[PDB]
Design a protein around this ligand. Structure first.
Ligand SMILES: O=P(O)(O)O[C@H]1[C@@H](OP(=O)(O)O)[C@@H](OP(=O)(O)O)[C@@H](OP(=O)(O)O)[C@@H](OP(=O)(O)O)[C@H]1OP(=O)(O)O
Lengths: 142, 579, 600, 255, 141
């Protein structure tokens, strides 16, 4: 299962964090640092997969933000690598060419998008079409 | 794909609005915010045209910010800074010298051959500029220019253009042309730097009087290179340098000392200058251990070589280098080395007291090096030996484990230096056989039973105590124990054979170490062949270890004296170690 | 949106100091209460927003010790945007206060009990995001009900399935295998694949403790997978991603099937084989898009299929086919595929039905390593060559390992040296090969070589001895590089001291040349090596009298005779005076040939 | 005060410092540090007349399920480089700490495991002591777990001694002593009765115990200066021992 | 001379830097990070030689000030230079800490171009620099 999902910038700063496991805030902070240290040190010659504590991390870099899913060792790497991209395509449609600050000012909507596509450590909805239609129905409400 | 690459919104677009906003106070804030982004690795390259247009300004603080931003892309990609070259040259016959220099320094920190063209002549004018902050920055710029590849021959209307500015009415200016000169000179053909020399020394060592903190040093360092001829030439050279208890201790001080020591090949005490100069040099060096901790380390690493060369200089000054508890480990250790390099026949007095101090402290590493130090005290100076061995015996009584073991090892080397002298102590030494974990110490005792086997009767049961766990044992100990027991036998046949079978049989038949196996055989083939010729070959009067421990080969030491300022002076290594 | 939020955030970015940040944060916290305490009650807009700011502050890393009641009242709003923020706040700041937990549970009670699927949605997610024991006790019995009921909407269904799954991971006892099971199973045949996708996750976790209860799924999972993978261009347009139909559900179905042994119904087995054969064929088809997303999606499916094939371990055609497809990935610019391919092959090399298939790609594994850049990938290439190494390979493997080492980085050296030694010991054809390997191992990377290993290579040159001359020359030609490291000087100097005579005949390698070569290492070596070289040196006095005085004056010297080290000075004196005192017969008796070692 | 009562006296003014650290590791079979942390405490045993003011000094290492970097001092400690206090008399805990960075891993465990079909498993494990050769580690144990369906086992090892314990499903290897910068090997041929019948062997990690005379965190004590104002003795009069004991905690290598 | 000047934070991250010679790339920054900042059981010294490259450093609270070359430089100078830079910085914004460094990126780049040309230590005592320096330092307490 997914243990957590992070979106972070080159600088180490977190832009989203969704946890599917019990951690205290100290720990959540430690994990957020640790992930930054591992992922900002790798050029494009490295794989998108790396073992991390007793789990592993799938990651991809879109400009200056790192999308990162931490998952169980036995989970499918490419499945998650592409889940990330499917998610980024949704984000990109939902914010009309998404940029780092979109995730800042609309941070609470970002969680809406996530819970659409991921719940309880598993992929929920993959269809870009359905997700956007729900999201825009959600936006029209009061 | 190009997700987050969006150009038509986000932080880039926002900052672009402010770089274009018509109020220069909001534009200053843009350029800072862009400088802050580069520094966090954000690709602000998109903005470069809008940030270059902020240079079309009266406001000083603004241009200043743009140059900073443009200086960041000099080193990052020198191609990104090829695109504001047309209005650099413009900005160096400017009103305000603050701007003039600011186009020269930024032109010379760029690294590709599109730079040769636009700069060959504007720099020609910044050296003829009537403001010295520009000639300070042109001088350093001429140096920057050589850096980029090729010799060039218009370059030999540039070397000479620099030599002009060594003669100048500003110690900041001249002292930098000097720095330029020696550096550019060390991509080496021989006869570079114009030997219009007798004159230009007078210009350097006047500049040095009025000079800045750091101007002096580029001077001092560029002198030493040259060998005077005869002889009293040397004299006043050295009578000018005298006031170096200057600003930038120790770079100033030590860059002097460098010169003040290549030129100590005089007919010395025909005139007591030699005695004048050497009285001088003690005080300033001493002062550098008040400076700061890092600066010290360097000082001491030079002092170390200096003390080996001209030992007279600091002979009287040992208390200078006594250890402060709060000194970093590395100042402690170099302090210690030098404390023993100066341990006169007379100052062992407190020097020994000053090491009983150290071996009782908590820094376990430094403690150990301190009781070694007492060792090489007993060894350097003969008359301390008796008192060193006393101190050592005291430290061993404390029962502090690490101190004991270090001491035993040191006591072994003392017995070797002063044989047949400290023998009653052996009995008191074996008392502590209970608590010797470390290989070295075990090997020392073992060697000490040695060697003095015929003195002591229990000696067998002692040496036998180790045969139980001959393995588990350091191959150094194994070796030492092999040799130890063939000694025992070579003075007590019948008596020993009880055991000596075991030990040759364990090196020969049981040991995987081929070097150890060798040694068992070699001894087996001596003993079990010739009962007297063996005694000759082993128990011979070995020569006395003379204190070679810390000591540099005298030729190499002169190489390192001809370097005293530098890196090689800290590593105590020639520059062949890094080409 | 909420302007006051956007301002608070813009003020926080414009801040030019962590001081000023913290000031602008304390300012907002005062303002927020204030207004929470204030006599004038607030509009929904304002609660909603101020809660939202509190969440923001929290996410910057600062503490928040109020707001919780205000977040809870938003739950009871009939305004979505208000509920949403209340639900988000409690999902992100979980507080202990059992007064609030009871309220939260009421809100969830209502929202669930509403028939509004947006509100049902928020409710189910809150539960699922928080998973509190108390939440389980309130709702664990209701979730299965909502999941199955004929009337609840697909999106709710999805959200309820994964909700239930979490309730089952944190509170299994509140999730007995009731009566809903088969109706859960039937979800596998839903039209909405998002729903199918949700259920598959649930069922997978449930079928790991409860295989018999869900063993019905196998058949329906095979049916779905096969309809899925054979679907046309214009099928499942929603769930097609870069021309690949339903990659994530495919993976998932394939994974559910790894909960069970092969389907027991022949026809089913067959549909499954057809299925996998198909997946395996698609890997052989060229990409429909040059975008890496297409092949990553396709391969995700492939690899999960490969996993299923391994785990069943029952179709040898498929295992072989899987090997070969893996092997073609080894020659790919995609570091990701190279990596996964080595990974899966390593598994595959421990099953009989595939071991020999894997051996087949030895050459490709080696060529991939020989030119790899990612260290993790090199690492795993080397692990595969160890996995696939036997008698038929040993030598090809060892030779390339050695070859690779000559120009290797450092990252990888240590591991390979260890491996080379180990495979050498196990698979040595003859003594000579072994010695040829070890000596060369030591020449190239002796800094990593064990003592046990160099002890052995010397110790071996006795018993089967006819290698001595080879050893002697090899050690020699090695030593005569300016490069040259310590354990070489050790084995080098031990061997030449003992069998240097067999190469002293050549004038390219005379006693004097041998000696000086050795001595040009001496003063650079650690003291035990010099102890060893000192023994070499006197053996030289014995074998070659042509050079006994060059040697004696290196022994008579100060740096040997007055040596700080006890062993160095002991030997230099013992040996100096051996070459001086006694006979020549004695000298030759004492430093003869040196007997051979015993056995194990 | 209130932790140190008035008018204490001893003929012989001593103090002892025990640095006691526990090192934890998880590591991949390729040697990637997946997680690692040190838990420590300095224990001071002080017999000092009067009310001594103490100034303590150490190196850079400590800064002041998921391990967090932390440091906690005794109630007596005052902060400003250096720590200063009037210590309680006899034994107490001066400080407690945890570090996660730049840990010195006393051993590298390198596993070589080889599933020959479903009937034989070949296991080799090499351990490298990764510290100064002059220092010695003791009470070494390597514990190599075996699968449940293990028919039997034959084990060879050149250093120490080892043996298979079936109640614990484990090969247990022991080494009384081992110096730094050495290497050691064990080999094992394990025989397998094939149940399974689903599920590859889910492989638990190899674990070690050991003890070393240094702080795996790198902590070094540099000074401890005693200044008693009223009384007769000075820092020069105070006898001082330091000990470092580094123990293994959960020190694991996946195979 | 001074061929590379980097300032790290308590985790070996390059907070801000300026190269002055192309003779040193990334390979420099890493060596110093790996062997000095994240050093294990090594004999620390203010000067280290790895990859045939020399490294000077001082430490301020939690900040690493480094200085770097492949030349045979006046060692003594570097440290003298470095203590004055710290004399300069602290007189523009007080405590020399990761935060205060971070607040004053614009300013610090500016002291650097001024205090050091192509690596040569220049007139760098506070009062002289009030002319050549445009920025003020964001002091916090
Ligand atoms: O930012 P201010 O100028 O102080 O205005 C704030 C406030 O914004 P914040 O509390 O978030 O800073 C309100 O919300 P927004 O609508 O700007 O989001 C609000 O204005 P509304 O009442 O229109 O919501 C309110 O009251 P006021 O209307 O009196 O300006 C209040 O100002 P006070 O602190 O003076 O109440």
């Amino acid at each position: 299962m997914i243990r957590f999902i992070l979106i972070q910038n080159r600088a180490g700063k977190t832009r989203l964090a969704k946890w599917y496991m019990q951690f205290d805030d100290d720990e959540k902070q430690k994990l957020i640092e640790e992930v930054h240290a591992v992922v900002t040190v790798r050029d494009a010659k490295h794989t998108n997969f790396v073992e991390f504590r007793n789990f592993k991390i799938i990651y991809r870099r879109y400009a200056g933000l790192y999308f990162c899913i931490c998952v169980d060792v036995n989970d499918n790497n490419l499945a998650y690598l592409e889940a990330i991209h499917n998610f980024v395509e949704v984000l990109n449609e939902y914010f009309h060419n998404v940029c780092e600050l979109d995730l800042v000012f609309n941070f609470y909507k970002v969680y809406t998008v996530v819970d659409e596509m991921f719940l309880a450590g598993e992929i929920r909805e993959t269809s870009q079409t359905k997700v956007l239609k729900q999201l825009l129905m959600l936006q029209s409400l009061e | 794909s190009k997700y987050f690459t969006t150009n038509k919104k986000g932080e880039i677009f926002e900052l672009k609005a402010e770089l274009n906003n018509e109020k220069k106070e909001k534009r200053k804030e843009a350029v800072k915010k862009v400088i802050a982004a580069m520094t966090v690795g954000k690709d602000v390259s998109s903005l470069f045209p809008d940030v270059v247009n902020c240079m079309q300004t009266d406001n000083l603080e603004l241009k200043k910010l743009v140059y900073l931003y443009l200086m960041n892309y000099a080193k990052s990609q020198p191609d990104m800074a090829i695109m504001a070259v047309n209005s650099f040259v413009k900005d160096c016959e400017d009103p305000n010298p603050l701007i003039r220099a600011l186009a020269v320094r930024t032109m010379g920190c760029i690294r590709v051959d599109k730079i040769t063209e636009y700069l060959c002549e504007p720099l020609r004018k910044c050296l003829k500029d009537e403001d010295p902050y520009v000639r300070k920055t042109a001088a350093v710029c001429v140096a920057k220019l050589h850096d980029i590849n090729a010799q060039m021959v218009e370059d030999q209307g540039f070397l000479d253009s620099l030599r002009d500015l060594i003669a100048d009415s500003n110690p900041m200016v001249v002292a930098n042309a000097v720095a330029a000169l020696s550096e550019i000179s060390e991509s080496h053909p021989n006869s570079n730097l114009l030997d219009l020399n007798p004159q230009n020394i007078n210009k350097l060592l006047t500049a040095l009087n009025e000079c800045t903190e750091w101007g002096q040093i580029f001077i001092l360092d560029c002198l030493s290179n040259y060998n005077p001829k005869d002889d009293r030439e040397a004299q006043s050279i050295c009578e000018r340098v005298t006031p170096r208890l200057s600003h930038a201790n120790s770079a100033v001080v030590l860059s002097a000392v460098k010169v003040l020591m290549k030129f100590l090949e005089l007919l010395p005490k025909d005139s007591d200058y030699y005695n004048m100069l050497l009285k001088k040099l003690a005080p300033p060096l001493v002062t550098l251990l008040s400076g700061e901790p890092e600066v010290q380390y360097v000082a001491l690493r030079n002092i170390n070589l200096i003390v080996q060369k001209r030992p007279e200089i600091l002979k009287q000054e040992i208390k200078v280098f006594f250890v402060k508890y709060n000194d970093p480990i590395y100042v402690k250790l170099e302090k210690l080395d030098i404390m023993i390099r100066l341990a006169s026949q007379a100052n062992i007095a407190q020097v020994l007291a000053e090491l009983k101090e150290y071996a009782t402290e908590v820094d376990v590493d430094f403690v150990r090096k301190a009781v070694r130090a007492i060792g090489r005290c007993a060894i350097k100076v003969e008359q301390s030996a008796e008192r060193c061995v006393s101190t050592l015996l005291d430290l061993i009584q404390t029962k502090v484990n690490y101190v004991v073991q270090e001491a035993i090892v040191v006591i072994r080397d003392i017995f070797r230096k002063y044989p047949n002298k400290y023998e009653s102590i052996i009995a008191t030494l074996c008392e502590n056989l209970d608590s010797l974990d470390e290989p070295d110490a075990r090997a020392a005792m073992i060697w000490i039973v040695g060697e003095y086997a015929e003195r002591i009767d229990n000696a067998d049961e002692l040496l036998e105590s180790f045969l139980e766990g001959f393995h588990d044992e350091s191959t150094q100990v194994q070796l030492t124990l092999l040799t130890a027991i063939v000694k025992l036998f070579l003075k007590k046949p019948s008596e020993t054979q009880e055991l000596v079978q075991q030990v040759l049989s364990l090196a020969t038949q049981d040991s995987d170490n081929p070097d150890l196996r060798d040694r068992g055989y070699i001894y087996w083939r001596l003993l079990s062949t010739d009962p007297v010729t063996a005694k000759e070959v082993v128990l011979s009067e070995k020569p006395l270890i003379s204190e070679e421990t810390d000591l540099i080969e005298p030729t190499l030491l002169d190489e390192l004296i001809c370097h005293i300022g530098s890196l090689a002076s800290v590593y105590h290594k020639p520059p062949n170690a890094f080409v | 949106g909420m302007r006051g939020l956007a301002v608070f955030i813009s003020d926080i970015r414009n801040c030019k100091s962590k001081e000023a940040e913290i000031k602008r944060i304390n300012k907002e916290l005062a303002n927020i209460r204030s207004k929470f305490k204030g006599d004038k009650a607030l509009d929904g807009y304002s609660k909603k927003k101020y809660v939202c700011k509190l969440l923001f502050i929290f996410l910057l890393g600062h503490d928040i010790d109020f707001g919780h009641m205000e977040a809870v009242n938003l739950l009871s709003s009939n305004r979505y945007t208000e509920k949403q923020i209340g639900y988000l706040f409690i999902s992100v700041l979980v507080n202990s206060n059992s007064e609030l937990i009871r309220l939260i549970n009421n809100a969830i009670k209502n929202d669930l009990a509403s028939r509004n699927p947006t509100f049902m949605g928020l409710a189910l997610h809150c539960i699922a995001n928080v998973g509190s024991r108390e939440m389980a006790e309130a709702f664990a019995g209701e979730i299965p009900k909502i999941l199955v009921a004929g009337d609840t909407m697909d999106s709710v269904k999805q959200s309820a399935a994964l909700c239930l799954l979490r309730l089952y991971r944190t509170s299994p006892d509140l999730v007995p295998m009731g009566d809903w099971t088969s109706r859960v199973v039937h979800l596998l045949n839903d039209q909405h694949l998002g729903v199918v996708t949700a259920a598959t996750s649930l069922i997978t976790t449930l079928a790991q403790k409860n295989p018999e209860e869900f063993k019905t799924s196998v058949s329906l999972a095979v049916s779905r997978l096969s309809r899925i993978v054979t679907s046309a261009s214009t099928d499942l347009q929603d769930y097609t991603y870069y021309f690949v139909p339903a990659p994530w559900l495919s993976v998932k179905l394939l994974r559910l099937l790894q909960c069970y042994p092969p389907p027991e119904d022949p026809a089913v087995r067959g549909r499954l084989t057809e299925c996998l054969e198909t997946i395996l064929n698609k890997a052989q088809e060229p990409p429909k898009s040059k975008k890496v997303q297409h092949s990553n999606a396709k391969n995700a499916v492939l690899f999960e299929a490969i996993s299923l094939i391994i785990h069943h371990d029952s179709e040898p055609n498929l295992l072989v086919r899987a090997c070969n497809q893996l092997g073609q990935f080894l020659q790919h610019r995609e570091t990701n595929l190279r990596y996964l391919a080595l990974e899966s092959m390593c598994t595959l090399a421990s099953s009989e039905f595939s071991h020999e298939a894997v051996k087949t790609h030895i050459e490709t594994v080696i060529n991939a390593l020989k030119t790899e850049r990612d260290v993790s990938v090199r690492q795993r290439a080397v692990d595969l060559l160890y996995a696939m190494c036997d008698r038929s390979n040993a030598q090809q493997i060892v030779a390339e390992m050695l070859s690779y080492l000559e120009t290797a980085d450092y990252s990888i050296r240590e591991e390979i040296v260890l491996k080379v030694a180990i495979l050498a010991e196990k698979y040595a054809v003859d003594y000579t090969w072994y010695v040829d390997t070890i000596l060369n191992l030591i020449r190239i990377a002796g800094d990593y070589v064990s003592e046990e290993v160099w002890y052995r290579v010397i110790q071996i040159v006795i018993n089967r001895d006819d290698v001595q001359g080879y050893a002697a020359k090899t050690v020699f030609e090695a030593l005569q590089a300016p490069a040259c490291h310590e354990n070489l000087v050790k084995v080098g100097g031990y061997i030449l001291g003992e069998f240097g005579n067999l190469i002293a005949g050549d004038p390219r390698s005379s006693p004097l040349i041998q000696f000086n070569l050795l001595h040009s290492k001496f003063h650079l070596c650690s003291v035990p090596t010099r102890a060893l070289l000192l023994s070499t040196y006197i053996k030289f006095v014995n074998l070659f009298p042509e050079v006994k005085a060059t040697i004696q004056d290196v022994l008579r010297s100060d740096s040997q005779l007055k040596n700080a080290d006890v062993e160095l000075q002991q030997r230099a004196v013992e040996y100096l005076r051996l070459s001086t005192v006694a006979s020549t017969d004695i000298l030759a008796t004492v430093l003869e040939e040196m007997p051979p070692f015993p056995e194990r | 005060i209130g932790w140190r009562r008035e008018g204490i006296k001893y003929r012989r003014n001593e103090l002892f410092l025990d640095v006691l650290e526990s090192v934890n590791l998880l590591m991949s079979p390729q040697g990637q540090v997946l997680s690692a942390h040190v838990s420590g405490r300095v224990v001071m045993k002080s017999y000092l007349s009067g009310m001594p003011e103490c100034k303590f000094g150490m190196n850079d290492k400590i800064v002041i399920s998921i391990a967090i970097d932390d440091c906690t001092f005794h109630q007596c400690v005052r902060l400003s480089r250096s720590i200063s206090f009037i210590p309680p008399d006899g034994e107490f805990e001066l400080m407690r700490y945890r570090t996660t960075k730049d840990i010195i891993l006393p051993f590298r465990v390198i596993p070589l495991v080889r599933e020959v079909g479903r009937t034989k498993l070949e296991v080799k494990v090499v351990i490298k002591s990764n510290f100064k050769p002059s220092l010695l580690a003791q009470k070494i144990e390597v514990r190599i777990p075996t699968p449940l369906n293990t028919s039997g086992v034959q084990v060879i090892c050149m250093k120490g001694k080892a043996k298979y314990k079936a109640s614990e499903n484990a090969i247990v290897w022991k080494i009384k002593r081992m110096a730094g910068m050495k290497e050691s090997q064990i080999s094992a041929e394990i025989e397998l009765l094939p149940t399974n019948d689903k599920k590859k062997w889910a492989r638990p990690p190899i674990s070690m115990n050991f003890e070393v005379p240094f702080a795996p965190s790198g902590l070094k004590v540099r000074y401890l200066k005693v200044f008693e104002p009223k009384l007769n003795y000075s820092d020069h009069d105070v006898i001082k021992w330091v000990r470092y004991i580094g123990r293994s905690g959960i020190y694991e290598t996946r195979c």
